[PDB]
Amino acid sequence: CTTPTAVAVTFDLTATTTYGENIYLVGSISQLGDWETSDGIALSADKYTSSDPLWYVTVTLPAGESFEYKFIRIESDDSVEWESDPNREYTVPQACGTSTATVTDTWR
């Protein structure tokens, strides 16, 4: 049929942030820093608006891979605030003709 071996996964996170917060993704595999805050992936606020307070990042991950992950907020002090437990979980899909995936999460 044709299943790719890599999937570009977009993590769309709804999160209301103050000026000077940045948002990172960290998770349980080496691509997501494994689980080190300093190896986490910076999300962009390019698409953030008042009615849709969206941060996002796209990460190419290998198909069929599972992991756990959390988002973290870093205020200017590099005080870290982590999401609440539990860890979130995801499996990158493995499906015919599918090279993109979207994960839709809301800070909690």
Closest CA to 77 of 17, 18, 33, 21: 21
Q: What is the CATH number of the domain that holds 58?
A: 2.60.40.10
Angle at 77 between CA 42 and CA 14, to 5 degrees: 40
13's tokens:
């996170």
8 φ, ψ (degrees, to nearest 5): -90, 110
- Tell me the technique behind this structure: X-ray
Residue range(s) defining the domain that contains residue 1: 1-108
The C-alpha atoms of residue 33 and residue 14 are separated, in whole angstroms, by 22
Resolution of the structure in the document, Å: 2.0
What is the rounded radius of gyration, in angstroms, for the C-alpha atoms of the chain?
14
How many structural domains are present in the chain? 1
- What does DSSP say about strands 54-62 and 80-82: parallel, antiparallel, or unpaired? unpaired
